[PDB]
Short mmCIF file of C-alpha atoms in Angstrom, two decimals:
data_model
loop_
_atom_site.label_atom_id
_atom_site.label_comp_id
_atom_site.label_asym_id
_atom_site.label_seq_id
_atom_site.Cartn_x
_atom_site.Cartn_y
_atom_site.Cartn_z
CA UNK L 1 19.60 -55.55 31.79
CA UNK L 2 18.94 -53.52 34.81
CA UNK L 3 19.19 -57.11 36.98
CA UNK L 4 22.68 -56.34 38.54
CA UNK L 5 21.64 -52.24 39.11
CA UNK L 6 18.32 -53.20 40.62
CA UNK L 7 19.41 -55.90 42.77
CA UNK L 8 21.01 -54.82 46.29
CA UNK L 9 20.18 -52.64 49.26
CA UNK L 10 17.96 -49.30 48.85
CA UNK L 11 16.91 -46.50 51.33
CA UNK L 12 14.34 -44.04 50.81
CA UNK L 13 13.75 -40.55 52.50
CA UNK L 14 12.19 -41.69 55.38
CA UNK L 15 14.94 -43.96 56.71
CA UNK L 16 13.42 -47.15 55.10
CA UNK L 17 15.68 -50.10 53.69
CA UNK L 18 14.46 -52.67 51.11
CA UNK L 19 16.91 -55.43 49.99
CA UNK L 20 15.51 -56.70 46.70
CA UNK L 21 16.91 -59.77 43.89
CA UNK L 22 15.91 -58.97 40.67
CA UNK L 23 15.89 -62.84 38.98
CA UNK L 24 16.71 -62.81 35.17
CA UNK L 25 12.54 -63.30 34.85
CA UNK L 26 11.43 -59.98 36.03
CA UNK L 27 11.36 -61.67 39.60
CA UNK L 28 11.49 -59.38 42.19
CA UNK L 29 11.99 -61.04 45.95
CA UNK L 30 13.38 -59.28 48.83
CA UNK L 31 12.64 -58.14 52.27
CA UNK L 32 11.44 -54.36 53.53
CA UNK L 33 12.24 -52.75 56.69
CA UNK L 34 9.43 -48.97 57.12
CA UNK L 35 11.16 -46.77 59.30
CA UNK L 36 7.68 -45.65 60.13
CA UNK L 37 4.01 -46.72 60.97
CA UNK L 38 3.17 -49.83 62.42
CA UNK L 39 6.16 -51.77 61.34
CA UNK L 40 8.83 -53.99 63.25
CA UNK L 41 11.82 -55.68 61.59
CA UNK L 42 11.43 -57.07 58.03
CA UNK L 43 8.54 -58.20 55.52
CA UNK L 44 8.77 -60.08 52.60
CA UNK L 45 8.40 -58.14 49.33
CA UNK L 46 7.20 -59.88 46.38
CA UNK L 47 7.04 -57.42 42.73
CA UNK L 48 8.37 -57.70 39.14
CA UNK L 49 10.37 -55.31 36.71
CA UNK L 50 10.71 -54.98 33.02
CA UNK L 51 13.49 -57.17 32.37
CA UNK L 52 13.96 -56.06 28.86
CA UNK L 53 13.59 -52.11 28.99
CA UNK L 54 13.75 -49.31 25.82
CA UNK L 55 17.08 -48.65 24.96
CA UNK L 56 16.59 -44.53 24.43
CA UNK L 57 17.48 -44.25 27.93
CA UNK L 58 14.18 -44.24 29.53
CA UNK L 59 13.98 -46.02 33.02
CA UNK L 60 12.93 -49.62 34.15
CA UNK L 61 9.33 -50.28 34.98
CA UNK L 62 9.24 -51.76 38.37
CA UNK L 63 6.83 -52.60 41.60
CA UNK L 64 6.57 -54.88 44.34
CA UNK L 65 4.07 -55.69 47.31
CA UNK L 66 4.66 -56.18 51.26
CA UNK L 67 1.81 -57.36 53.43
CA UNK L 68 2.52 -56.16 56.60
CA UNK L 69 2.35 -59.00 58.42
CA UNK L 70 5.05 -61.30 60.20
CA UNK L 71 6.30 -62.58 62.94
CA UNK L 72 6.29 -59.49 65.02
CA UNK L 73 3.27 -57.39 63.96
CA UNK L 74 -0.04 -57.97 61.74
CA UNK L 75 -1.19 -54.11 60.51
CA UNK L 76 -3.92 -55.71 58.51
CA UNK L 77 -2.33 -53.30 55.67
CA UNK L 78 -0.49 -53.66 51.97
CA UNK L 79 1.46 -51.37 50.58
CA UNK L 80 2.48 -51.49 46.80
CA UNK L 81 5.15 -49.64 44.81
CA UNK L 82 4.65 -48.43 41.10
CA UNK L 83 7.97 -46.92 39.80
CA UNK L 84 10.98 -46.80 37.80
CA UNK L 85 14.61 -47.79 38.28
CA UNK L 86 17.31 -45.09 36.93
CA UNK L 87 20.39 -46.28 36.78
CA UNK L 88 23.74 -44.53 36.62
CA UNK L 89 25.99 -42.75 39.29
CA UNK L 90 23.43 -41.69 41.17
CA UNK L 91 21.12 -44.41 40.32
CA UNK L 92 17.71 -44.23 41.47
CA UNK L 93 14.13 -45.60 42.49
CA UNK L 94 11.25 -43.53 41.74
CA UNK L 95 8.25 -44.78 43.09
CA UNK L 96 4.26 -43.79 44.15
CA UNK L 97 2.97 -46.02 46.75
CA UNK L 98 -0.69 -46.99 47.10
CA UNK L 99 -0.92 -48.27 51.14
CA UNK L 100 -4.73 -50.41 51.55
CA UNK L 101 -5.62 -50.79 55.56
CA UNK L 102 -8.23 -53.77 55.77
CA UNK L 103 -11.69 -51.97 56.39
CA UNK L 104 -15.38 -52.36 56.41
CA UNK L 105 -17.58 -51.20 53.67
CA UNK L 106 -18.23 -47.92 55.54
CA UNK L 107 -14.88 -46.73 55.94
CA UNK L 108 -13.73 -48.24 52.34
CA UNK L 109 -14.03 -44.55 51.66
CA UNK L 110 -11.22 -43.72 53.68
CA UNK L 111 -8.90 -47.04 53.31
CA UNK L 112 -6.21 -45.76 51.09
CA UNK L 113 -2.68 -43.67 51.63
CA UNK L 114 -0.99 -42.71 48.58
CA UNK L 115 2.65 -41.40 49.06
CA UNK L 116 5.95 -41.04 46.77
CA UNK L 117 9.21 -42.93 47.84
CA UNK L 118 12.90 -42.17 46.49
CA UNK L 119 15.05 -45.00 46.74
CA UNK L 120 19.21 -44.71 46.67
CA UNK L 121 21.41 -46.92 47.27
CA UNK L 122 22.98 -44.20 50.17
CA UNK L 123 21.90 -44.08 53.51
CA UNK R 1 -8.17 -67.22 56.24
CA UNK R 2 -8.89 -66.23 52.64
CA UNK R 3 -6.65 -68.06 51.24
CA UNK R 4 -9.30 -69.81 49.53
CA UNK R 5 -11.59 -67.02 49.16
CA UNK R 6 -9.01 -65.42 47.11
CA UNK R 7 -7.84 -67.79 45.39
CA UNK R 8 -9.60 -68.47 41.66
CA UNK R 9 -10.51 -66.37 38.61
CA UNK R 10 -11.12 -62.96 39.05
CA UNK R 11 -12.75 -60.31 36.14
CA UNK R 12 -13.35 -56.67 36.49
CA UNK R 13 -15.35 -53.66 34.77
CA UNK R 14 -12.60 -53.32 31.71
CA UNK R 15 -13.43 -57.32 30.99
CA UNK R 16 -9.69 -57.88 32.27
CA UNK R 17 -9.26 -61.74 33.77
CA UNK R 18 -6.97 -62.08 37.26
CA UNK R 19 -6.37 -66.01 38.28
CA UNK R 20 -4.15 -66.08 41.65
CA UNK R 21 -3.18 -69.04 43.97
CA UNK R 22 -2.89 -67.54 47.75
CA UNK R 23 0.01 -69.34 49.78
CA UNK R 24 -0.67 -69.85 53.38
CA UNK R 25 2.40 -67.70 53.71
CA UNK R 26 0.56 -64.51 52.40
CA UNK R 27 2.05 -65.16 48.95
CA UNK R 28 -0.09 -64.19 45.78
CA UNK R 29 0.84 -65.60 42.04
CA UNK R 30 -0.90 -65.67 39.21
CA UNK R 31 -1.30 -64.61 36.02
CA UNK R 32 -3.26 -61.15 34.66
CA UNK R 33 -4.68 -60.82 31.08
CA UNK R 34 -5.54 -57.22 30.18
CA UNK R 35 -9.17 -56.88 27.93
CA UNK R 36 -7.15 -53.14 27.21
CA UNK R 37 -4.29 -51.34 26.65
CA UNK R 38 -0.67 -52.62 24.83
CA UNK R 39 -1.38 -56.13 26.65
CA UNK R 40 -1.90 -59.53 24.53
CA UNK R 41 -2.18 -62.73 26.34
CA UNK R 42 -0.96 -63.58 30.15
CA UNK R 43 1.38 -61.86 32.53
CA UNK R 44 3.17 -62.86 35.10
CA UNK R 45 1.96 -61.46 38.36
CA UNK R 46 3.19 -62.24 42.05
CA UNK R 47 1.85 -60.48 45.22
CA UNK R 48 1.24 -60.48 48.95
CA UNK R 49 -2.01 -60.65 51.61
CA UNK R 50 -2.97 -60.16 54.78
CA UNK R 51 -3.31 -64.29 56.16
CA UNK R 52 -4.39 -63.32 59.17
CA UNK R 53 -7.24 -60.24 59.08
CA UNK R 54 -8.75 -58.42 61.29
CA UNK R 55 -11.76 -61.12 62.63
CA UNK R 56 -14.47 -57.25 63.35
CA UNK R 57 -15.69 -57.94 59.61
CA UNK R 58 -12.90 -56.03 57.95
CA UNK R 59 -11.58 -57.13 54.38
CA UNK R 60 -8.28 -58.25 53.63
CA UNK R 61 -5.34 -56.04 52.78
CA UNK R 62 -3.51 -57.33 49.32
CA UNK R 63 -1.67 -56.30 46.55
CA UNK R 64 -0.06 -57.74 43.20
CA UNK R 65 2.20 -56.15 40.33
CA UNK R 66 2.23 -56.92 36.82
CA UNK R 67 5.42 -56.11 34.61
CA UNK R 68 3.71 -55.90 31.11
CA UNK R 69 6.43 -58.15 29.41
CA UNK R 70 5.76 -61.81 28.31
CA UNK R 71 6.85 -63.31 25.29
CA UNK R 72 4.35 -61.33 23.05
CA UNK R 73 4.85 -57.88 24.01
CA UNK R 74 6.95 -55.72 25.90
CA UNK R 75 5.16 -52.43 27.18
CA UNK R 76 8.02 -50.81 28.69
CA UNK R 77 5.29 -50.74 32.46
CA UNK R 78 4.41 -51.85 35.09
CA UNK R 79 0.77 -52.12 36.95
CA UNK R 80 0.59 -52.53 40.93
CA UNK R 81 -2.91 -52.84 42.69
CA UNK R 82 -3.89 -51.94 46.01
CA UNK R 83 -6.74 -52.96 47.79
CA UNK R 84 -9.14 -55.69 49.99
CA UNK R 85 -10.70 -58.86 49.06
CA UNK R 86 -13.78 -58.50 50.74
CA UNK R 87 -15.81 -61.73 50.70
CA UNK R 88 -19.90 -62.73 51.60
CA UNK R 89 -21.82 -63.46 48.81
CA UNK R 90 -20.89 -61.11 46.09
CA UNK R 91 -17.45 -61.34 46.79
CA UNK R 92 -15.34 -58.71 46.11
CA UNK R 93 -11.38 -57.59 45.15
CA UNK R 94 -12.18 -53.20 45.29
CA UNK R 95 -8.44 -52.10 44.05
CA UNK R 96 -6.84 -48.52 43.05
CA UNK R 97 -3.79 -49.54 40.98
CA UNK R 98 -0.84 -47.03 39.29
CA UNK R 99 0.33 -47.80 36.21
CA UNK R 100 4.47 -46.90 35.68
CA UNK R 101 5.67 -46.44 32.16
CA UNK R 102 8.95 -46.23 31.76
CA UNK R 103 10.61 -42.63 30.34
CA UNK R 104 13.30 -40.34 30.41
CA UNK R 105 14.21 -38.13 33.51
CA UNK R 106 11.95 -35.36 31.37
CA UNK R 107 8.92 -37.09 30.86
CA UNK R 108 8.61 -38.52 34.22
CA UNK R 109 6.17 -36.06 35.45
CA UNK R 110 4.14 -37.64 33.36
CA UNK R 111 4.81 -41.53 33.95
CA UNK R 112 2.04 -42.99 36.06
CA UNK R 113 -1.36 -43.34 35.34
CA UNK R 114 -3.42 -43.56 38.71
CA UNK R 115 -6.84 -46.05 38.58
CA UNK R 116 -9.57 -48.09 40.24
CA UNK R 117 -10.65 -51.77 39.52
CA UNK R 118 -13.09 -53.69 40.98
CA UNK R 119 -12.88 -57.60 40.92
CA UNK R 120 -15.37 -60.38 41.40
CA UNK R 121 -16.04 -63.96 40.16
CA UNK R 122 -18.86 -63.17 37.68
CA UNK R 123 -17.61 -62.03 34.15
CA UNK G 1 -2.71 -17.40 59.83
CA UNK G 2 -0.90 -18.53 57.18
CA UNK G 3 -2.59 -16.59 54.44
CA UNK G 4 0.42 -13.84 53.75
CA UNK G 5 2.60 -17.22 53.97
CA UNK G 6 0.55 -18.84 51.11
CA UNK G 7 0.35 -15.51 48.98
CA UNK G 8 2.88 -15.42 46.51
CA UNK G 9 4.79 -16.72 43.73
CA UNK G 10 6.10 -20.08 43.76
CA UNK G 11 7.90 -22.57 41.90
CA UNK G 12 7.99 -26.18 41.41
CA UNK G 13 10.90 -29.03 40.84
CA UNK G 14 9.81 -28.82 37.07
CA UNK G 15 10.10 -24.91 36.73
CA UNK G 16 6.43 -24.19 36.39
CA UNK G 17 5.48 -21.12 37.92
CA UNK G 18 2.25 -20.63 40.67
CA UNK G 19 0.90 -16.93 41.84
CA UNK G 20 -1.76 -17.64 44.40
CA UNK G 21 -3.33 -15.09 46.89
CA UNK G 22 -5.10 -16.52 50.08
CA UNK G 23 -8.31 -14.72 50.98
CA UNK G 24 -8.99 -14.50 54.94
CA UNK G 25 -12.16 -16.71 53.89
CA UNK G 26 -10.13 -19.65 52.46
CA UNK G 27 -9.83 -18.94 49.08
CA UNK G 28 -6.75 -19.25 46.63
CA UNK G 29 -7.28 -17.75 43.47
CA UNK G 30 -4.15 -16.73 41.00
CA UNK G 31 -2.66 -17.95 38.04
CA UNK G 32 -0.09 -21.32 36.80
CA UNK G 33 2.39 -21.53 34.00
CA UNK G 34 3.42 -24.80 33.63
CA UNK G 35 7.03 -25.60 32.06
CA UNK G 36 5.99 -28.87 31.03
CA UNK G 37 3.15 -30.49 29.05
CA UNK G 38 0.63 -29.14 26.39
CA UNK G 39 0.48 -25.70 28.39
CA UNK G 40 1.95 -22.08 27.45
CA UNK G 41 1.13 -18.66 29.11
CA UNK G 42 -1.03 -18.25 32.12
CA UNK G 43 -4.05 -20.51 33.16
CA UNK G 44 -6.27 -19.30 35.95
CA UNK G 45 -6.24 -21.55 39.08
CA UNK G 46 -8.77 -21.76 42.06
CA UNK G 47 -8.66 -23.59 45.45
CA UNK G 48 -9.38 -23.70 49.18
CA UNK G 49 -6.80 -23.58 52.29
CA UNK G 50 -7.75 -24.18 56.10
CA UNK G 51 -7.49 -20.60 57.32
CA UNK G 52 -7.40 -22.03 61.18
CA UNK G 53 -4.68 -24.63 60.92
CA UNK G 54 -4.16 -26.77 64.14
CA UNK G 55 -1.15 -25.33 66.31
CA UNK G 56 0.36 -28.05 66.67
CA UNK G 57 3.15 -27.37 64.30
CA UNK G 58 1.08 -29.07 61.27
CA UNK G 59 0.78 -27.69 57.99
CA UNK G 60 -2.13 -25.92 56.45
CA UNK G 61 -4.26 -28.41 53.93
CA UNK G 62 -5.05 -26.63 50.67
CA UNK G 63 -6.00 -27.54 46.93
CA UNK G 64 -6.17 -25.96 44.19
CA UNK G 65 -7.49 -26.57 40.15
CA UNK G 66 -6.09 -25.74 36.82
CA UNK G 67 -8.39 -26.43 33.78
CA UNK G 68 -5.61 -26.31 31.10
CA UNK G 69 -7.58 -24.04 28.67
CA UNK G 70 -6.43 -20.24 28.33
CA UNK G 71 -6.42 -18.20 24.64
CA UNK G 72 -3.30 -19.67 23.41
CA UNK G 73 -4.32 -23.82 23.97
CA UNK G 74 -6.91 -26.14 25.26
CA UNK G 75 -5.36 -29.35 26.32
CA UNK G 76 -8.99 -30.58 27.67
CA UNK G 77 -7.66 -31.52 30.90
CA UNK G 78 -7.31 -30.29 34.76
CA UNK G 79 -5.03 -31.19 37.58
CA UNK G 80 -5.99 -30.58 41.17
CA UNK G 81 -3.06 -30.17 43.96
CA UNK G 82 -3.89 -31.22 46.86
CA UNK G 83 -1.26 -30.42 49.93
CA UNK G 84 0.19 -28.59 52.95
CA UNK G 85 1.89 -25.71 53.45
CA UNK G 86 4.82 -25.56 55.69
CA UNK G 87 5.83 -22.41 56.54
CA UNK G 88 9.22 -21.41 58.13
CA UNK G 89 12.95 -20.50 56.94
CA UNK G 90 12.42 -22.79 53.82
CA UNK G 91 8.80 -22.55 53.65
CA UNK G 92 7.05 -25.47 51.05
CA UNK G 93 4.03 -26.43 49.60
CA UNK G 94 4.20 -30.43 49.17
CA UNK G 95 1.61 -31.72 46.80
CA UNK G 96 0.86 -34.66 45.55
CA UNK G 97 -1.72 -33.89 42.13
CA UNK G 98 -4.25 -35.56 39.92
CA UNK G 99 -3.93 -35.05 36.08
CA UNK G 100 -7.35 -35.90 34.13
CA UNK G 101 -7.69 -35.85 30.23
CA UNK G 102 -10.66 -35.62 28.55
CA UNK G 103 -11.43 -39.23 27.08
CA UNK G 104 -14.52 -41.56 25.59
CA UNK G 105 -16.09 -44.41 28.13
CA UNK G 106 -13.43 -46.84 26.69
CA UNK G 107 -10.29 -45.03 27.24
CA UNK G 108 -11.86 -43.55 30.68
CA UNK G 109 -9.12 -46.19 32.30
CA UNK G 110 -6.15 -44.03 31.22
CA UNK G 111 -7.69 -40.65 31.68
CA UNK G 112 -5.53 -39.90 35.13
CA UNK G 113 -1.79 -38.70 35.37
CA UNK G 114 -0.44 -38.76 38.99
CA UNK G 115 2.24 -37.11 40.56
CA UNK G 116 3.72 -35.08 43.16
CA UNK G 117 5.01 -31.28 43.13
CA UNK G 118 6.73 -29.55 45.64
CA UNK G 119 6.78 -25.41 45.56
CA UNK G 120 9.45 -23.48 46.96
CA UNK G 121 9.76 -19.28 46.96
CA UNK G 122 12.89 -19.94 45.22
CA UNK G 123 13.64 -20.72 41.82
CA UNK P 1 -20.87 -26.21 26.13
CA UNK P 2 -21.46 -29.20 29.33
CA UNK P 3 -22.48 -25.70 31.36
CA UNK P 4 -25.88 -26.56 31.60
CA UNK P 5 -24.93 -29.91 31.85
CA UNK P 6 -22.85 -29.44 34.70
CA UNK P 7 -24.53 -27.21 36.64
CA UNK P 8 -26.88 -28.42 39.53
CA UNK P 9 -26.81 -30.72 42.28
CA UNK P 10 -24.91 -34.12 42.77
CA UNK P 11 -25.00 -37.01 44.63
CA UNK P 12 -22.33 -40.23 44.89
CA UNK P 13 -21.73 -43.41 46.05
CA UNK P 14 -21.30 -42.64 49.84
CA UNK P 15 -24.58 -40.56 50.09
CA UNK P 16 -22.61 -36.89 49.50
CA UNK P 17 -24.40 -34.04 47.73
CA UNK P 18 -22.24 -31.75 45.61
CA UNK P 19 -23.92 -28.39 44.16
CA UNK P 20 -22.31 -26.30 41.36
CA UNK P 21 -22.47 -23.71 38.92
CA UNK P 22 -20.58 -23.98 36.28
CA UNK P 23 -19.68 -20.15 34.55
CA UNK P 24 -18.97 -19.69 30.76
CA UNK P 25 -14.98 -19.17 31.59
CA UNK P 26 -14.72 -22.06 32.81
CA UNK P 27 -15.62 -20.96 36.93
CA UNK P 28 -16.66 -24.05 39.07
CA UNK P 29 -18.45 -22.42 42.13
CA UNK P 30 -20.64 -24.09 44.77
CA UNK P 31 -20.70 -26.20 48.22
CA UNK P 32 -19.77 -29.66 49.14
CA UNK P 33 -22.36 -31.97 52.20
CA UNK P 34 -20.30 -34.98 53.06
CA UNK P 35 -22.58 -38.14 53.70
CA UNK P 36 -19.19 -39.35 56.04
CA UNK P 37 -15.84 -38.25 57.65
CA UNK P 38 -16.19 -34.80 60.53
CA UNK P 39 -17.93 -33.03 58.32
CA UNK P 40 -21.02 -31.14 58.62
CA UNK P 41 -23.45 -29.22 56.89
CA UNK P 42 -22.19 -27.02 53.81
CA UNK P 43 -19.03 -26.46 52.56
CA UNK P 44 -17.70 -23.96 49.66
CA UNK P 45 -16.47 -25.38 46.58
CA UNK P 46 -14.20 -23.72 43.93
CA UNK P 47 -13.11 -25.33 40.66
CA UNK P 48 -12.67 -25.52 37.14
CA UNK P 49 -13.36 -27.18 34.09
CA UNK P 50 -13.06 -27.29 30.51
CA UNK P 51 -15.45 -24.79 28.61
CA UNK P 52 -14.65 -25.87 25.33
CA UNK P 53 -14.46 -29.77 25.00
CA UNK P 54 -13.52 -31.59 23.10
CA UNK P 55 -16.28 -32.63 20.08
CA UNK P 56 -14.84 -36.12 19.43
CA UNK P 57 -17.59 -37.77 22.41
CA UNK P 58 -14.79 -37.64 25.09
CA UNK P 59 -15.69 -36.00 28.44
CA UNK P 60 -15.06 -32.91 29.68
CA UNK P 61 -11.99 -32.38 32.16
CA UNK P 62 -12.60 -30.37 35.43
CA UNK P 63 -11.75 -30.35 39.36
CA UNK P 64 -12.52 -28.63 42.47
CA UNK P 65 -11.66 -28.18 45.78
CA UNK P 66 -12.97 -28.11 48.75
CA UNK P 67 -11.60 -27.01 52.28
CA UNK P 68 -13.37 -28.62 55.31
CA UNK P 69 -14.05 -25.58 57.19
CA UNK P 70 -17.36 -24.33 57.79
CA UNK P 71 -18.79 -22.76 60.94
CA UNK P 72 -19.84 -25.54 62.42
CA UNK P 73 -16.77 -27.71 62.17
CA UNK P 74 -12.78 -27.81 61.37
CA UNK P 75 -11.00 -30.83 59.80
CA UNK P 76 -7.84 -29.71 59.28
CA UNK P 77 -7.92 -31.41 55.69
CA UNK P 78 -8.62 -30.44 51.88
CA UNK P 79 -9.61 -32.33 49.00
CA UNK P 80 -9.64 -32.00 45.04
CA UNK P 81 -11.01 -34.27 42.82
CA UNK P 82 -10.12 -34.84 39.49
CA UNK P 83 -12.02 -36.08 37.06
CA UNK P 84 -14.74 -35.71 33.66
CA UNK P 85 -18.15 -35.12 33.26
CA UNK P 86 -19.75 -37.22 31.02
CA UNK P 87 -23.43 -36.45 29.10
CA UNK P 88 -26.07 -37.82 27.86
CA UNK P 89 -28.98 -39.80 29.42
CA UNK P 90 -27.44 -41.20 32.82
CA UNK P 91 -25.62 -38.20 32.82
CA UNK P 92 -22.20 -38.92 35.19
CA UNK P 93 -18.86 -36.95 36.97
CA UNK P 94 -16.46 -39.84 37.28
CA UNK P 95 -13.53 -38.94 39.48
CA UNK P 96 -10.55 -39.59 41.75
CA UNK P 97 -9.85 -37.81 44.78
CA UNK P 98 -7.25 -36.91 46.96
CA UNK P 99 -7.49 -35.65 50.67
CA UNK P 100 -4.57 -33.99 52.05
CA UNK P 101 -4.97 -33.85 56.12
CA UNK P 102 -2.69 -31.15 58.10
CA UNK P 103 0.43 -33.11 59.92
CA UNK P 104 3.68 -32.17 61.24
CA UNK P 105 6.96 -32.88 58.68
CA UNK P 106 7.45 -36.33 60.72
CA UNK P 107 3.79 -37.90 59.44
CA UNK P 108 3.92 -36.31 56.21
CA UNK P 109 4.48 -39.64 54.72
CA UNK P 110 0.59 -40.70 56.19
CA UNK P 111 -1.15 -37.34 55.10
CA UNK P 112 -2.72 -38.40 51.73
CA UNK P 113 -6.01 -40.34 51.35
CA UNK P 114 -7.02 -41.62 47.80
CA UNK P 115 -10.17 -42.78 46.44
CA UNK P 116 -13.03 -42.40 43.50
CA UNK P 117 -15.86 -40.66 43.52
CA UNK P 118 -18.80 -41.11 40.86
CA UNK P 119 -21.78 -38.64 40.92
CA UNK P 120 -24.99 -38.26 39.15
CA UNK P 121 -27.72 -36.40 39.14
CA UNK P 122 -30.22 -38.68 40.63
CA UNK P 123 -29.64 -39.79 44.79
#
C-alpha cells in the first residue's frame, strides 16, 4: 500500500539521509547516512513495515535497525527506529529511536540514548 | 564474533520465543512469537549487530524489528528492540524496545508504548 | 540563573497548557492542563531544574510529574518530562516524557506511553 | 490508599537508595543516593502519584524527579521516572527512567539516557 510512498530518499532534522526499499513483504532494506556522532559514509539498514495498514487513515507501522559498523568506522553501537509513515503532500516519518552502545554490566545502566527523528522527503 | 553466540532460540520474562540466524555480515533474521498482546503465531523479524565488538569485555550492540503482520493477524504495529547480547555462562540479550501502533495525526501522542525485555536460552 | 526564564506559562505542540514557577532551590511546582487524553481542568505538577547550569551555552536539565488525578477525573496514571530549557529570543523547553497507566502484573508490559513535547511561550 | 505502602526507603538493582513520603494529595517528597554516575550523597526528590487507585489489583501510577545538584556535587542532568507501585508481600516500584543531561542545541540529539529501574523495600 504504502510500498511506493515509503520507498525513496528521506532526511531528518539533523541533516541525516536514509534511502530505504520497502519490498511488497514488509521488507525494509536500505542504507543510512547520521549527520552526527561517530558515523562515516553509509550503513546498511535492515527493518519491516505494515504492508497492509487500516484504511481510516491512520499511518503505517514501520522500523528498521543500523549497526554502526562498516568499512570506515565500528561504534560498537545500534540504533533502531519505531515509527509511522504518513503519507500525503507532505508525507512523513515519525519515528523514536532507541541507540544501545556495547557496555559492561556496570555501565549497562547508562547504555541507552533515546531520541525522536522526523523524516521528509526534503532536504 | 557472536555470531554464534547469538544465534539460536531466545525466551524472555513475558514467555515470548525469539529464534535469529546472525550473518557474518552483521545481519539478524528470524522469526518472533509473542506469549502477549494481538500476536498469534510467528513474525517475520530482520535486524543488525555489532560483528566486530569491543574485545575490553563489552557486550554486543544489536537490534531487530518486528511488523506484527503475518498471515494470521494484522496489528496495525510495529516492535523494534534495542540492546546487547552479552554472553558467559548465563548468556544474555538485555533489550528496551518501543512498540509503534499505527493512528491518526490526533492520536499520535499516544502511539508508542516504550519497554524492557530481557532474553536468554532457558524458558 | 534561569529560574525567571523557566517561570511561566507555556504551551506545547498539542495545546496543553504548563504554569511552572522555579524556586532559587531547584524546585518547579505549578499546574498542567492537558488538551489531549483522559484529562480536564488543572492537575498539580512538581519537578526539579539545575539552578547552576554549565556556561557553556547548554541548557538547564529539569523534570517534572503530573499524577493525572484532580476533582473532576482520575485517569490512574503519571507522566514525567524530562528536558532542557533553552532560553533566548525563542526560548524552549524540549522534552521527551514517560506516560505510565496503572495496570495488573500481566498487562505491566503495556503500562508506558512515550513521547516527546516541546513548550514554547507562545501559543 | 498505597500511602503507607509507599512511603519509606528504597533500594534497586544498581545499589541506589530512594526515600519518600508519600502525602494524602497525592505529594511525593524525599531524596535520591545514587549507587553510580557523579553523584554523591543526598539528593531532593519531588513527585507524584495516584492517591486513589484503582481497586481492580492494578498498580498505582506515580513519578518523581530528581535534579543532581546537591552541595557536594553538580551534574548538569535531571531524571524522572515513571512508573507503578505494586503491593503486597514482595512489595515493588517498577519503573522506566529518563535522564536528560544539559547540552548545547548541536548535541541535543545525544542528551537523553533511558533505562528501568525496579525498587523494593529490602537492599
Amino acid at each position: 500500500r504504502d510500498e511506493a510512498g515509503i520507498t525513496g530518499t528521506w532526511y531528518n532534522q539533523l541533516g541525516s539521509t536514509f534511502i530505504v526499499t520497502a519490498g511488497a513483504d514488509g521488507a525494509l532494506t536500505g542504507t543510512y547516512e547520521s549527520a552526527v556522532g561517530n558515523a562515516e559514509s553509509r550503513y546498511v539498514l535492515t527493518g519491516r513495515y505494515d504492508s497492509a495498514p487500516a484504511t481510516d487513515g491512520s499511518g503505517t507501522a514501520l522500523g528498521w535497525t543500523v549497526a554502526w559498523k562498516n568499512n570506515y568506522r565500528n561504534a560498537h553501537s545500534a540504533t533502531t527506529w519505531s515509527g509511522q509513515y504518513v503519507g500525503g503532500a507532505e508525507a512523513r516519518i515519525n519515528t523514536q529511536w532507541l541507540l544501545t552502545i556495547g557496555t559492561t554490566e556496570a555501565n549497562a545502566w547508562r547504555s541507552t540514548l533515546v531520541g525522536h527523528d522526523t523524516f521528509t522527503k526534503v532536504k
